[PDB]
């Protein structure tokens, strides 16, 4: 009795390279395979041939990759054909009308009326390679009204679209936006915002910043702040400063009137404190403030002139712990009997990861671990083969922090299923490292099943899912009686920013029916460039630059590559600070487009495939559910 498998991504993007992975379980000789796709329901036919031969000498491997043409256009669906001689398997898959990515660069985020906005539009596909499409670029004022409209193509420009706009000296104040969409996809629009404010050039600069990035509520020391003021040419200021503290409730601000203090400024340096006493008198009860944020307002009046500068530091997070703990990386499903690996995510109150945070599990600690630079550490707990849902709690245990200062977090992990009640599992485990392209990564295949059908399992099929597409496919051999097999996977620049790994095995079941156990795991790689680009001083170091001077710039990039440059004042660059066009911020947009949802595993045997962005369908009666939705469950 044979078995024939068709494996395909969850949502099929039009006009793009898509892989239809085919196999053959238990078949004497080889069988011709042709795949064809139709509109559902209708005799349309978007692809005809594309044949592959399932050679026994190659374990029956099949690629057949094709791009679906875009034509007559409630969320559309396509019926896919998988003919293996006589018996044919079909699937109703969801279609996606999504071009790719537009990125918008702006030299500054704030402008004066009169000045020029220098912006570029980067046109790239799903592999983040440049592609020549038609794009439409608008400039809106804060009131939504478009004041500049352009239709331009991005071919021969190899990606880049340089544009310019002069702000008239009498114009709307506020957050002007730059909307940009592919003419192929007026549905999907990309935006960047900038301000116009108005000409304001203060005499001196004031920076108000606390000694701590946060406030610990029970800490009786209070929130100390350092007021620094100095002229634009580095003269230390002498004057007076009026500070006042307040609590921000999401986007509603409550001024604490009794926190207003008047301090003298001596040699550009000043000191003030918001006490816990006065803090709690601005509302009561301490715990209600955890999650709220504090802000300072500093007004510095000179001793010489009447000149006066204001400065505001807000978003100072009130915390019960200097650290956070997250389970957003950890799978939500465990396999009773097998070990369960936790991907604990530890962040500072602001959002950035925290290096070296000793963490352990509640109920049974010891062993411990150490956080990497990406703020992740792995923790495993072997629990009993129980059908009961597992509730885990992970605390932190940093040295030189009090026990009442640490952070705690709970998650709920539901059991597998093994339909129907056969208790045979597969566990994928990976080492948590700062892994860089070019290195090798060991992948552990753990088997747990009754000692009767454990000799029949000869191979594991593993599948790579990268950037929503199917990446690589292969096999993993197994000698009967083996409880663990390792896979040497060679990571390249094709796995950035992150890749999923689905592994499954199939056999004649314990009772009589087919059993197909599956599991998935998520692995993050160093989220940087596919190529590279470096800017440094071309001249032999020597001495520092001087105004109006000739200097040399070295550009270390990729052959044939096009490099677009701009030189901005550090004063506006550090003034962003959220619309920064980083490489990390580029991959973040690729991750939030990725499919699907669950950071690994599933509710059942085929709930794994859907939660990783795949549709498994058997020649028997074992398939995944139909995905009619494009996005995920609400965060």
């Amino acid at each position: 009795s044979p078995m024939y498998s068709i494996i395909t991504p969850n949502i099929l993007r039009l006009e793009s390279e898509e892989t239809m992975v085919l196999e053959a379980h238990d078949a004497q000789g080889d069988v011709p395979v042709t795949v064809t796709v139709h509109d559902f329901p209708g005799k349309k036919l978007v692809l005809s041939s594309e044949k592959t031969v399932l050679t026994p000498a190659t374990n029956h491997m099949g690629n057949v990759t094709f791009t679906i043409p875009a034509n007559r256009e409630r969320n559309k669906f396509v019926t896919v054909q998988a003919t293996f001689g006589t018996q044919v398997v079909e699937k109703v898959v969801l279609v996606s009308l999504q071009s790719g990515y537009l990125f918008i660069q702006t030299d500054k985020t704030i402008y004066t009326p009169g000045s020029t906005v220098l912006y570029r539009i980067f046109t790239v596909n799903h592999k983040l390679l440049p592609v020549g499409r038609t794009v439409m670029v608008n400039i809106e004022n804060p009131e939504g009204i478009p004041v500049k409209q352009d239709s331009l193509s991005s071919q021969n420009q190899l990606g880049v679209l340089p544009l310019s706009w002069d702000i008239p000296e009498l114009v709307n104040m506020g957050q002007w936006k730059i909307r940009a969409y592919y003419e192929n996809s007026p549905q999907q629009v990309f935006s960047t915002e900038f301000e116009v404010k108005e000409y304001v050039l203060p005499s001196f600069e004031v920076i108000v910043e606390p000694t701590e990035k946060f406030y610990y509520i029970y800490n009786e020391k209070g929130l100390e702040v350092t007021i620094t003021a100095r002229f634009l040419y580095g003269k230390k200021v002498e004057g007076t400063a009026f500070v006042i503290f307040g609590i921000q409730d999401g986007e509603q601000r409550i001024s604490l009137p009794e926190s207003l203090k008047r301090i003298p400024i001596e040699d550009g340096s000043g000191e003030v404190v918001l006490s816990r006493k006065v803090l709690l008198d601005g509302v009561l009860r301490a715990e209600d403030l955890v999650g709220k944020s504090l802000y300072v307002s500093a007004t510095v009046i000179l001793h010489s002139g009447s000149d006066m500068v204001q400065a505001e530091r807000s978003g100072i997070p009130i915390v019960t712990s200097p650290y956070q703990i997250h389970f957003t990386k950890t799978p939500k499903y465990f396999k009773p009997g097998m070990p369960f690996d936790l991907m604990v995510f530890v962040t500072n109150p602001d959002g950035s990861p925290a290096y070296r945070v000793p963490v352990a599990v509640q109920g049974e600690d010891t062993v411990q671990s150490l956080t990497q630079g990406d703020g992740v550490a792995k923790l495993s707990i072997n629990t009993h083969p129980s059908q009961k849902p597992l509730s885990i709690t992970v605390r932190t245990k940093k040295q030189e922090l009090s026990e009442a200062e640490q952070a705690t977090r709970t998650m709920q992990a539901l059991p597998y299923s093994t339909v129907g009640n056969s208790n045979n599992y597969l566990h994928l485990s990976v080492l948590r490292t700062e892994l860089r392209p070019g290195e090798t990564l060991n992948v552990n295949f753990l088997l747990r099943m009754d000692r009767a059908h454990e000799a029949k399992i000869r191979y594991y099929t593993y599948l790579i899912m990268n950037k929503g597409r199917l990446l690589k496919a292969g096999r993993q051999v197994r000698e009967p009686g083996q409880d663990l097999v390792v896979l040497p996977l060679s990571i390249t620049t094709d796995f950035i920013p992150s890749f999923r790994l689905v592994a499954y095995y199939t056999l004649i079941g314990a009772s009589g029916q087919r059993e197909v156990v599956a599991d998935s795991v998520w692995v993050d790689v160093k989220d940087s460039c596919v190529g590279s680009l470096v800017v440094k001083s071309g001249q032999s170091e020597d001495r520092q630059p001087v105004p109006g001077q000739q200097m040399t710039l070295k550009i270390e990039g990729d052959h044939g590559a096009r490099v677009v440059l701009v030189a901005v004042d550090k004063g506006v660059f550090v003034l962003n600070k959220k619309n920064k066009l980083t490489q990390s911020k580029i991959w973040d947009v690729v991750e939030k487009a990725d499919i699907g949802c669950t950071p690994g595993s599933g509710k059942d045997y085929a709930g794994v495939f859907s939660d990783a962005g795949l549709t498994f369908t058997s020649s028997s009666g074992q398939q995944t559910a139909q995905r009619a939705e494009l996005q995920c469950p609400q965060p």
Binding site: Y199, V564, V572
Partner: protein, 976 residues
């Protein structure tokens, strides 16, 4: 004892929606305005008033106690995220990497010149390879640093013979080392400095670490124009050899004036006579001219009444030349569009882009884009458009905006959402069921209450006919709304009294063809001389009304009434060779250009204008021809001559003649429609001014309209004195206060002739003076400064205005700064023959009086002295003409001798004492019969002792010297 903190504690109470009114009430007032007084200027609810009143009541009593017994008194406020001015981005260029790769590494050297800014630059790079995709590089930091830096700090402008003290600021950036520097001001004969040709002026100064130093210089500018001031610096021990060379502008002693002299339509045939047209043009008055200033007469020939305008409306940097007024308000800002729109239309319909230049068009379209972009700043929810951003929306203004927008839909992209929402607004919300339109804002334009209803509906109905077949499907009840308004017109039209309305509403009715019979007669008989529809006093409105009447005449295709009207409109240019205001200009522009487009007459250009200036030997022969990119020609003369113009054969055009000169100060003699009292007083010395301000003063303006109804859109045009600058805090408070005494301030130095501050007002009360005051700071100390000017005027009727000058105060003997040495004696040399040495022998007199230049030699007796602030007038009676010039003068007649203010102390002429004077024919000033004299570098002034006092010791020596001179000049004269 806190006051700053007792403040904000009071703002501490009161709900969120109210802290605005309390905050603004706690503030003081530039005027002495009281608490209750401040109210009723306040525009919000009465809940807002109750807080405002309670809070300044609270504070004015609290600081009223501070006087009884150096502490701050300001607001901490909320949310100012300041600093917007950052250095412009650069290196906006693209380079691809074509160097042979070394395992990916494709190094590409790139050479650049760093900007001359002391800052830290952030170079951002983004790669794009069709092999390996996009790659955003890390920021590269370059800290551009300089140890020593000079900044030369000069005033915006200095008036000739003023005494500015400039300063050279020097910065030492070194973090732990004080710089010693040798700094020098270089000699420039343009101005008296401490540096002369004799010896230089260098001095050593030591600048502390991480700080700056100011080095003052006194300069007395002798010549007008742009003069170069240069300080040079050589720092000790370091070979840092730096210097700064800026240019300060020395303006003359009065106020700039473009005086329109003539206009005259140039049309041979038409009443220009078969005796082809001859045109007499009188000399410009220039009676009030400033002694020793230039003038210039600009004669312009126009091939078409619209030509200068067409030329200007098309160009971006000459577009502002259509209007003498500021353009920072709802309807004023429409220069950005209106002229250009009609000008492009005009050239489209007459097919002239070919000869004129097609390149200019794409340029012209960009202006209308820009203008449109600007106009959107005035647009509110929903689509309503107000005269000032975030303020009560205007029915008149929206109507206007709807017109130009509707008439632009073809030229640039107009958002139909923006356009049709406005038409949707005017109709659904502003039109009464009677067909009339309502105005709920304060009126921008020309004020039973018919005609109020009749005029505004006329203006709105003219707007809706442009949106007719654009907002068809967008706005449902357009065609019915126009009908309602059209019906209201042809019923009440026969009751119209004001000549203005009869035209505008006449045109509105003409557009429908509903101006007929008895109504048409009404429209036609309202014109004086059958060439204009005009009203008493309302001058620039008559240019507006007449223009409409032309548009109505063209709408009726009645091309007999038209010629004389176009002639009249052609010549109503009293502010330069131009109509003055926006609404005036764009109205005549449209109509005159509409005449060009709707003419059944091939009125072609072959004009042959010849010019004979009595100053030039050669005639001037201009030939303006149709089919040549121009239709323009101009000529300049430095002399104020009366000349004669001759036009010949075929063409209807214009001949604008305008002279520019500098009229003296002196407050306007007959403010006929506006009252103005201007005051400047020293603020208390502990007021706390900005760190650079040497001295602060309070400037109070008080103005009142002389009409039976309030004046609408009006302007204060305040030109600061020299070195002075207005406190932008106080002006803000005046415009952004919950009270609000102002609609906005401009502070625009268009260019040159002293930096100006423009204040927009919604109205000027005719009931009482409308006072507002504000602080001015003096960032340089100056001596002998000339008065700054202030001008009020109605924005839409410039004919009504008032000009006053303001000046600190004497208090007995004006002071210099300084004398003590040659620097002071340098300045005085300029005026009056510098004796010095005090020899002055009889033999020395005869040599100097015999200069071939010496035209007159009088013995005068000083009758009256009328010393002003800018120039001194000495009225001298002639006692004996020892030598008469081209100016004959009788013994016993009087001549007025003018001297600069910087020479009063040197001349020291006491009233009713006798003098010996002489000088060149160059000294003569202002033609007969009454002549004046200018005491200049060639004017010998000397005291003539009286007879009763020739007995004294110091006099008998000097007495018979003058007696020997008197005879040896009458009896014998000059020997050679």
């Amino acid at each position: 004892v806190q006051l700053t903190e007792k403040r904000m504690d009071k703002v501490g109470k009161y709900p969120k929606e109210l802290r605005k009114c309390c905050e603004d009430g706690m503030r003081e007032n530039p005027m002495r305005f009281s608490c209750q007084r401040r109210t009723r200027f306040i525009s919000l609810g009465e809940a807002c008033k109750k807080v405002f009143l309670d809070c300044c009541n609270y504070i004015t009593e609290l600081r009223r106690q501070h006087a009884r017994a150096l502490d701050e008194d300001i607001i901490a406020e909320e949310n100012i995220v300041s600093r917007s001015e950052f250095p412009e981005s650069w290196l906006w260029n693209v380079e691809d990497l074509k160097e042979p790769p070394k395992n990916g590494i494709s190094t590409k050297l790139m050479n650049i010149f760093l900007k001359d800014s002391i800052t830290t630059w952030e170079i951002l790079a983004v790669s794009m390879s069709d092999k390996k995709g996009i790659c955003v590089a890390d920021p590269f930091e370059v800290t551009v640093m300089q140890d020593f830096f000079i900044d030369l700090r000069l005033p915006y402008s200095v008036v000739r013979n003023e005494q500015v003290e400039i300063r050279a600021v020097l910065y030492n950036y070194r973090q732990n080392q004080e710089l010693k520097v040798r700094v020098e001001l270089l000699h420039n004969p343009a101005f008296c400095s401490l540096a002369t040709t004799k010896r230089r002026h260098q001095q050593t100064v030591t600048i502390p670490p991480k700080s700056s130093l100011s080095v003052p210089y006194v300069i007395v500018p002798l010549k007008t124009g742009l003069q170069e001031v240069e300080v040079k610096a050589a720092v000790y021990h370091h070979f840092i050899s730096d210097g700064v060379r800026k240019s300060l502008k020395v303006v003359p002693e009065g106020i700039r004036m473009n005086k329109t002299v003539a206009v005259r339509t140039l049309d041979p045939e038409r009443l220009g006579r078969e005796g082809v047209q001859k045109e007499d043009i009188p000399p410009a008055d220039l009676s009030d001219q400033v002694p020793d200033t230039e003038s210039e007469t600009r004669i312009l020939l126009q091939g078409t009444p619209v030509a200068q305008m067409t030329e200007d409306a098309v160009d971006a940097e000459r577009l502002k030349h259509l209007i003498v007024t500021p353009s920072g308000c709802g309807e004023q800002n429409m220069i950005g569009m209106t002229p250009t729109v009609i000008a492009v239309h005009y050239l489209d319909e007459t097919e002239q882009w070919e000869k004129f230049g097609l390149e200019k068009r794409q340029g012209a379209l960009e202006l209308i884009k820009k203008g449109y972009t600007q106009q959107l700043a005035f647009r509110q929810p929903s689509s309503a458009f107000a005269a000032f951003v975030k303020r009560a929306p205007s029915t008149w203004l929206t109507a206007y905006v709807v017109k130009v927008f509707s008439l632009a839909v073809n030229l640039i992209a107009i958002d139909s959402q923006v356009l049709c929402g406005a038409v949707k607004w005017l109709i659904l919300e502003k039109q009464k069921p009677d067909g009339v339109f309502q105005e709920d804002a304060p009126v921008i334009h020309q004020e039973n209450n018919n005609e109020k209803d009749m005029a505004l509906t006329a203006f709105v109905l003219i707007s809706l006919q442009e949106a007719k077949d654009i907002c068809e499907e967008q706005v449902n009840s357009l065609p019915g709304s126009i009908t309602k308004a059209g019906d209201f017109l042809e019923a009440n039209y026969m009751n119209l009294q004001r000549s203005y309305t009869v035209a505008i509403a006449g045109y509105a009715l003409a557009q429908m063809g509903r101006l007929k019979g008895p109504l048409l007669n009404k429209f036609l008989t309202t014109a004086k001389d059958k060439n204009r529809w005009e009203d008493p006093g309302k001058q620039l409105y008559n240019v507006e009304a007449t223009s409409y009447a032309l548009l109505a005449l063209l709408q009726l295709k009645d091309f007999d009434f038209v010629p004389p009207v176009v002639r009249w409109l052609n010549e109503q240019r009293y502010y330069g060779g131009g109509y003055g205001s926006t609404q005036a200009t764009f109205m005549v522009f449209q109509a005159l250009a509409q005449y060009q487009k709707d003419a059944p007459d091939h009125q072609e250009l072959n004009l042959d204008v010849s010019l004979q200036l009595p100053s030039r030997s050669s005639k001037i022969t201009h030939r303006i021809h149709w089919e040549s990119a121009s239709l323009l020609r101009s000529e300049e003369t430095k002399e104020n001559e009366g000349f004669t113009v001759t036009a010949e054969g075929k063409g209807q055009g214009t001949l604008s003649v305008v002279t520019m000169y500098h009229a003296k100060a002196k407050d306007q003699l007959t403010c006929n429609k506006f009252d103005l009292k201007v005051t400047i007083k020293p603020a208390p010395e502990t007021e706390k001014r900005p760190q650079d301000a040497k001295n602060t003063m309070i400037l109070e303006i008080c103005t009142r309209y002389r009409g039976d109804q309030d004046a609408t859109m009006s302007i204060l045009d305040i030109s600061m004195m020299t070195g002075f600058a207005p406190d932008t805090d106080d002006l803000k408070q005046l415009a952004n206060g919950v009270d609000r005494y102002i609609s906005k301030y401009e502070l625009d130095k268009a260019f040159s002739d002293r930096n100006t501050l423009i204040i927009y007002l919604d109205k000027v009360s005719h009931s009482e003076d409308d006072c507002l005051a504000f602080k001015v700071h003096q960032y340089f100390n100056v001596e002998l400064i000339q008065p700054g000017a202030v001008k009020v005027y109605a924005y839409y009727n410039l004919e009504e205005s008032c000009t006053r000058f303001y000046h600190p105060e004497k208090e007995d003997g004006k002071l210099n700064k300084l004398c003590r040495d040659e620097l002071c004696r340098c300045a005085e040399e300029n005026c009056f023959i510098q004796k010095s040495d005090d020899k002055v022998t009889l033999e020395e007199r005869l040599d100097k009086a015999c200069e071939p230049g010496v035209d007159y030699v009088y013995k005068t007796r000083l009758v009256k002295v009328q010393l002003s602030n800018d120039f001194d007038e000495y009225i001298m009676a002639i006692e004996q003409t020892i030598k008469s010039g081209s100016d004959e003068v009788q013994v016993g007649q009087q001549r007025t001798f003018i001297s600069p203010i910087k020479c009063r102390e040197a001349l020291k002429l006491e009233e009713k004492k006798h003098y010996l004077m002489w000088g060149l024919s160059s000294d003569f000033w202002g033609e007969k019969p009454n002549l004046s004299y200018i005491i200049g570098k060639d004017t010998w002034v000397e005291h003539w002792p009286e007879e009763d006092e020739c007995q004294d010791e110091e006099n008998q020596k000097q007495c018979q010297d003058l007696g020997a001179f008197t005879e040896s000049m009458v009896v014998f004269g000059c020997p050679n």
